[PDB]
């Protein structure tokens, strides 16, 4: 059939035509590295994830102590743990850059590849959410309760959905255990979809910073991007290790060093940075149901993005106006994040509602509008 042995092998033909002979634009930038990073990231979490799971005991009377034992008794246990908890962040960082990139270069015009993306994100989000409960610390516990309790805002069909989800009447063992199972599962489901994600991609190839046919000049993934990719890896892995090796808990709140106690509530209940922006939007709307919706849509909105593209051009590279609107948006998230790490007192609250209000407004009205208006200035 064929000469060499990586095009006629029903296996190497998949380790090749997807990572070595793969046609890649010659001009994609660093914002394209997040792809592989995101992958590598997964490859790692799962691994450290198991390694931990091999020492964990899912039980409201041993969860905390096990995790603790894991750190104090297991060889490099502590190390393995850090890496995992921090791997979580690293994961999100890479995802957010990944996503931003796609938005700033209309990669979302790759509809499928995009929607699979969104799902992947959703799964990742859920995944962490459960993984957080496992150590069963104050925050673990309460974060569970606060969130899961939202579901009870749905009419009729919800007041039940909750007691079903808990396996009881409140977040308790029945929950812990099922969450652990779920946390073991979802990562795999992520890996799965990720495969589908990369497939819909290989159906069109990578979009490039300029937004114009790359066919005129494409390079082989290897060594061009395989090399670039690894450098990209190191340029990140560094701070990831740097923080995780010199400032372990810089990110993680302390109340989670206090064994969960359903009787007493922590002063402030606030998630990990990567959920802050959302938390802030949830808390902006006073009405469990509304806030829930806002939260949902705050992330679900992504699916719409494609249908909200009006520019005759793809990437914002040549569209100054859009660009700043884009950065206004980014900063708009920073704020929401910050607003989320703060209580519910003036000014915060008002600033809160605004930020969220502007968040949607941008992705719903500005972006598509400034896009049209943009088009006419090109005289199209």
């Amino acid at each position: 059939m064929a000469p060499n042995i990586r095009k006629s092998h029903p296996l190497l033909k998949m380790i090749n035509n997807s990572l070595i002979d793969l046609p890649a634009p010659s001009n994609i930038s660093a914002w394209w590295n997040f792809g592989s990073l995101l992958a590598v990231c997964l490859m790692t979490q799962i691994l450290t994830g198991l390694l931990l799971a091999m020492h964990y005991t899912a039980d409201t009377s041993l969860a905390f102590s096990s995790v603790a034992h894991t750190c104090r008794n297991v060889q490099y246990g502590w190390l393995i743990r850090n890496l995992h908890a921090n791997g979580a962040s690293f994961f999100f960082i890479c995802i957010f850059l990944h996503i931003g990139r796609g938005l700033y270069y209309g990669s979302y015009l790759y509809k499928e590849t995009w929607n699979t993306g969104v799902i992947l994100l959703l799964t990742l989000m859920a995944t962490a959410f459960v993984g957080y409960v496992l150590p069963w610390g104050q925050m673990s516990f309460w974060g569970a309760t606060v969130i899961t309790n939202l579901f009870s805002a749905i009419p009729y069909i919800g007041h039940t959905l909750v007691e079903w989800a808990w396996g009881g009447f409140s977040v308790d063992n029945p929950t812990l255990t099922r969450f652990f199972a779920l946390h073991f599962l979802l990562p795999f489901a992520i890996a799965g979809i990720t495969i589908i994600h990369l497939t819909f991609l290989h159906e069109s190839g990578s979009n490039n910073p300029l937004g114009i046919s790359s066919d005129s000049d494409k390079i082989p993934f290897h060594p061009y991007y395989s090399f670039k990719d690894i450098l990209g890896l190191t340029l990140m892995l560094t701070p990831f290790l740097t923080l995780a090796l010199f400032s372990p808990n810089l990110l993680g709140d302390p109340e989670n060093f206090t064994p969960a106690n359903p009787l007493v509530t922590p002063p402030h209940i606030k998630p990990e940075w990567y959920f802050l922006f959302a938390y802030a939007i949830l808390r902006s709307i006073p009405n469990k149901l509304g806030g829930v919706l806002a939260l949902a849509a705050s992330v679900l909105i992504l699916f719409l993005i494609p249908f909200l593209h009006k520019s005759k051009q793809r990437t914002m590279t040549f569209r100054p106006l859009s660009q700043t609107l884009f950065w206004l948006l980014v900063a708009n998230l920073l704020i929401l994040t910050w607003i989320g790490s703060q209580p519910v007192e003036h000014p915060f609250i008002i600033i809160g509602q605004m930020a969220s209000l502007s968040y949607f407004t941008i992705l719903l009205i500005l972006f598509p509008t400034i896009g049209t208006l943009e088009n006419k200035m090109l005289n199209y």
Binding site: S213, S216, W327, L328, P347
Partner: protein
């Protein structure tokens, strides 16, 4: 097959040299930096503004919060 069907391209010549024959990170000063600046320059007035415009709100927001904690001596001018 993903290398060949792409597009119809004509009359283009390209010359390149083996890595070994040329320099690793050539003209760091005469070319590199000047562009590193150029790039930086061009974008700053797009990116920076809103980020900066946030630092403010963060500052005012925060700063003003503290202020609302300190007591107002005017509440206590006739508590004899």
């Amino acid at each position: 097959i993903h290398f060949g069907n792409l597009a119809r391209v004509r009359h283009i010549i390209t010359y390149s040299l083996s890595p070994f024959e040329q320099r690793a990170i050539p003209n760091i000063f005469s070319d590199a930096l000047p562009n590193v600046w150029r790039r930086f320059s061009s974008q700053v007035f797009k990116v920076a503004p809103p980020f900066l415009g946030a630092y403010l709100l963060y500052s005012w927001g925060t700063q003003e919060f503290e202020r609302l904690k300190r007591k107002n001596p005017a509440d206590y001018e006739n508590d004899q």
